[PDB]
Amino acid sequence: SNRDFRGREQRLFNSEQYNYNSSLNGEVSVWVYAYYSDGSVLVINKNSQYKVGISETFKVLKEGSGAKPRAIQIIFSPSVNVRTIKMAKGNAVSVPDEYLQRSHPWEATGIKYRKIKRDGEIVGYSHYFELPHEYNSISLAVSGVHKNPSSYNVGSAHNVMDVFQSCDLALRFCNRYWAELELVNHYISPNAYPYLDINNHSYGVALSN
Amino acid sequence: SNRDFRGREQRLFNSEQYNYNSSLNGEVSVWVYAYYSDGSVLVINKNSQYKVGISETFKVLKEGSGAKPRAIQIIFSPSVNVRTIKMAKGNAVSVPDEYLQRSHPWEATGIKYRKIKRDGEIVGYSHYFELPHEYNSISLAVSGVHKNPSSYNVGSAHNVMDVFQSCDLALRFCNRYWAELELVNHYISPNAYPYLDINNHSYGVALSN
Amino acid sequence: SNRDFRGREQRLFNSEQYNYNSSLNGEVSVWVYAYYSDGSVLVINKNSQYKVGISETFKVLKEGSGAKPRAIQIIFSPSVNVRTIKMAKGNAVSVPDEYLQRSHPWEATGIKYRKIKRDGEIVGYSHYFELPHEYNSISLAVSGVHKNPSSYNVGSAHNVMDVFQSCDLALRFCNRYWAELELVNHYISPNAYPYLDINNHSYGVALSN
């Protein structure tokens, strides 16, 4: 019966979480997972309103003696507008991508992002690429804009200062895990984050509807 | 007599400093003081035009073996618009505040800021909060916008690039002091910064009028 | 003859590189070279669309026991609008420039920038200043805006979010070289960057026309 208000409230509880996230009041989140030759995983996460981005350098461990980055997986929350996703990369600690005079400052990589799904629902977006063995490090920057459900100008006369503030307010986290197993068990799963593991298995929590 | 031009110029000297600061040509400044279990104090200061903010992580010293953060005091210069103040925090190195799906990206904490006064003049604003003993660290972000004395649109077609530049131009300082006494004697007082100590004593310099 | 299409294409190849850089699709780049008492050189480079800036602290090596910064050379790519260049500095790890109440948040230093030329062509802009011996460090911030060839409003309703993204996407590099010779041989020259050495010799590559 629909006299089951406990069930109805539980249903609304989950749904409202899903919907608040995709409102412009909600966060847009990016994760950069760097996979090292020793099986360890380094993750950078930043969460912010309106837009979010990361600019990082992943270096060979122990002054060049330890493990080296082998691959990168970039994850965006479902609140991102996939068409706004941009990436700039260098394979070096020294401006790797050809010459400044001829470089485009970014590529629109949205079309390469796969949908991470649980129960038919999009829990995130994933772009995975491996690094050339010939390289010991990668400088990488990625950026995404929150879906704008309306025709609302977040960058209009009055609203632009809020976006400037969003830049100050963004929170960044950096963690290293010993293996993807630890990553899944202690980072991804407990926080209900979207993820694809090495076996192409999807993680995350469907909240709609 | 008002034939005392030395006195009159001294009066204008002080007043002009007070007033330039609160003009849009002046700085808005934020300080984040982190109080550690060993009595030491770590301070982060950033100063910038138009708006300013800080995003930091305060961790337990010596890889988790040393002292731990116990409390935070956030200070804004008098040039801040208290109503624009925003704060986002996590108690963890891992996205502490519940779940991303349900998180508001900030809280307006202005109403909790006390006025730091010297001689009846507001020299700054202070928000103090203690950290749960149960936690070994805190990731914290705070943001404030300069008071806009006029109806001037700093984020208008032409002026927005200046605000973007203000972001590049902001200066950040990080210092650690052995005790609040050292902090007061060698940081707060010499630089004429506003402050409240553990005994609720106010520091700073009245310049008006 | 103009039947030499190999020559004509080579000519267009070089020219197009020059021109793309100065289009709003191209990068604006800044370098900050810090010259240390031991002859070593530390360089910070950031490259980004629309505008670029750096905010750094150059400290005495080995916790204050090693070499100390003696001089700074700031280089901008030719795509910068020299009139938009701004600099804010402190000689301390503690808000060096007088008192916050009376500080202008930056100086327009464009008029002090020399043109670095190769073959009559501007390959960059250079501002060089020495540091007071009395100081062990310098906190420095510099900012420049890309030349806007048109009357195009990059900070208009729609375009402002792209500039916000440009902030996320900017790539920063930090390198230390043992002597200016190494710097020239392994950093400046291989990457075709503009530069002036200690003997006032100009480096870079003319690409026009």
Numbering used by the authors:
A (entry chain A), B (entry chain A), C (entry chain A): 8 to 70, 101 to 246
In the authors' words:
The fold of all the polyhedrins is highly similar – a β-barrel core sitting on a base domain, surrounded by a common array of five helices (H1–H5).
Compared to wild-type CPV1, CPV1Δ crystals also had a slightly enlarged unit cell (103.9 vs. 103.0 Å). The absence of the base domain did not influence the overall structure of the trimeric building block but increased flexibility such that the electron density for 40–50 residues in the inter-trimer contact areas could not be observed. These disordered regions include the areas in CPV1 which had been shown previously to bind NTPs, so that NTPs are absent from CPV1Δ. The base domain is therefore a region that is neither required for proper folding of the protein, nor for crystal assembly, but fine-tunes the crystal, ‘locking-down’ the structure, often in conjunction with NTPs. In contrast in the base domain deletion mutants all major cavities are connected, resulting in contiguous solvent channels running through the crystal lattice. We also find that the whole base domain is dispensable for polyhedra formation, although the biochemical features are altered dramatically when it is removed.
